[PDB]
């Protein structure tokens, strides 16, 4: 600090006094981003909790767009026999945005679930639902025996067993014209060499797990350089209090210290502004509580030192700041043996002016030598060290007043005193 004062004064000799040198600024320690509550997630339940699903050949396509997608309910939930994704990390889904989403829901036999994958073959893949080789999305399946099976054979679900050509990726074929399986044309007449184009699984509760019906939902994400309509929930940071931090409440960005607030906002009110129009209080979007905003330090740093001709030690004053902030002055970066000694020790003292380090708080009172402020003064005397004391207004004296006594002088003294007054200035043009 003494060298800093020397540099500030542009001199190697510093006289007795107090000099303003630098500013103690507290930098933020963390970052906080808070956004509205979980809110309106995309309608996953509609597809998943749907009472009845369509057929594999008539697989139902559901377009999802313009909504926040909370994929955590998919993998965080172990209510799915099969869970896999292609081209993306399943855990990363909650932090991804997509232009469009297509949920293909249907029912197929459990043993046939293997056919639901890129480059798969078989009747289900070829003629009921074909996937692209480079499919980008996720495939989900779960058991549906208790839902898609009935005693005596459940014949509601149908699948396409015959067709002229394999279905293209994301292609559905609902036309059920009699397929010409033989040289003799069927002419739309079922019979020999002309079989019912669809087929019914006939799910029964006695069916084995492999043969039991299984409900499958496939989420395919479309990215065509277009604006993203779906976006995973904006993960909001936790709540930090009583510490300097950069906060961003649903776009309202600021830096300060969040503290519990005793205000009372109206239900429609979000944040308050001071008389100067500066933001003063804010309410968390996720949950309804109010917090107050305060500046961090905004403090200044001054150096108290007797004349270098007299001594060499110094004392540091951090203006209008707590004594816990003092050592938070970008410390761990100054000189190891010279600045950190003034960082904190038993010498620390607190006054209305600010935190004072390097001066002992004695009880005795003396005439002010270096004015600290708020009635406190500092001086160098004692073994010699710096002492901060309370200013002595003057010597104590009482006049022996009485209603018939008097004091008359008997001798005098002639005193000569000097008074200096400026009269002019250099005539500069």
């Amino acid at each position: 600090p003494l060298s800093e004062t020397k540099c500030t004064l542009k001199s190697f000799t510093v006289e007795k006094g107090i000099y303003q040198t630098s500013n103690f600024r507290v930098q933020p320690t963390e970052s906080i981003v808070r956004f509205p509550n979980i809110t309106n997630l995309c309608p996953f339940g509609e597809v998943f909790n749907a009472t009845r699903f369509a057929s594999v050949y008539a697989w139902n396509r559901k377009r999802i767009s313009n909504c926040v997608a909370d994929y955590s309910v998919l993998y965080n939930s172990a209510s799915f026999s099969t869970f896999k994704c292609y081209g993306v990390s399943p855990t990363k889904l909650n932090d991804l945005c997509f232009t469009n989403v297509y949920a293909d829901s249907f029912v197929i036999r459990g043993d046939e679930v293997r056919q639901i994958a890129p480059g798969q073959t078989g009747k289900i893949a070829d003629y009921n639902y074909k996937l692209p080789d480079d499919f980008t999305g996720c495939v989900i399946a779960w058991n549906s025996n208790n839902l898609d099976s009935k005693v005596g054979g459940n014949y509601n679900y149908l699948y396409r067993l015959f067709r002229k050509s394999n279905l293209k990726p994301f292609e559905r074929d609902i036309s059920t014209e009699i397929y010409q399986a033989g040289s003799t044309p069927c002419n739309g007449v079922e019979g020999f060499n002309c079989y019912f184009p669809l087929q019914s699984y006939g799910f029964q509760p006695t069916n084995g797990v492999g043969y039991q019906p299984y409900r499958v939902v496939v989420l395919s994400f479309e990215l065509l350089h277009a604006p993203a309509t779906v976006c995973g929930p904006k993960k909001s940071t936790n709540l930090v209090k009583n510490k300097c931090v950069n906060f961003n409440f649903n776009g309202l960005t600021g830096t300060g210290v969040l503290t519990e607030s005793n205000k009372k906002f109206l239900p429609f009110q979000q944040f308050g502004r001071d008389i100067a129009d500066t933001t003063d209080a804010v309410r968390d979007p996720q949950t309804l509580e109010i917090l107050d905003i305060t500046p961090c330090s905004f403090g200044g740093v001054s150096v108290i030192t007797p004349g270098t001709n007299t001594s060499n030690q110094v004392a540091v004053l951090y203006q209008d700041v707590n004594c816990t902030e003092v050592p938070v002055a970008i410390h761990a970066d100054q000189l190891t043996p010279t600045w950190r000694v003034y960082s904190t020790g038993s010498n620390v003292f607190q006054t209305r002016a600010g935190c004072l380090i390097g001066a002992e708080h004695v009880n005795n009172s003396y005439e002010c030598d270096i004015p600290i402020g708020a009635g406190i003064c500092a001086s160098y005397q004692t073994s010699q060290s710096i002492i901060a004391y309370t200013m002595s207004l003057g010597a104590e004296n009482s006049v022996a007043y009485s209603n018939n006594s008097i004091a008359i002088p008997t001798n005098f003294t002639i005193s000569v005193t000097t008074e200096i007054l400026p009269v002019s200035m250099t005539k500069t043009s």
Partner: nanobody
Amino acid sequence: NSHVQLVESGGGLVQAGGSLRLSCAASGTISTLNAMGWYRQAPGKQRELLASISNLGTTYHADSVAGRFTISRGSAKNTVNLQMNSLKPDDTAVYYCNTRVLEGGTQIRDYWGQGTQVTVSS
């Protein structure tokens, strides 16, 4: 060193009612071209998407170019060609090419090329 790079070509001045075909070549450390797109930033106009193709073959075409520009992805799946049919005055623009790459399965990086100019006059 082989950072993802895009190159655009095929544009130029064309008489109204003509046709051309822009070719976009991708190079560098291309991990996965999840989405592939064509844009145009005409002189004095903001960049606007015209046609794009996802890695799954699905394609989007802007209404300003729908029905005239057809986007096709090459067999190598590294280059995309935008066949411009019946080029109209609105096609006068500096065409740019973009692709989205999922690096590490979590980083969406958009890469752009130099672009090529197209012009239609009366």
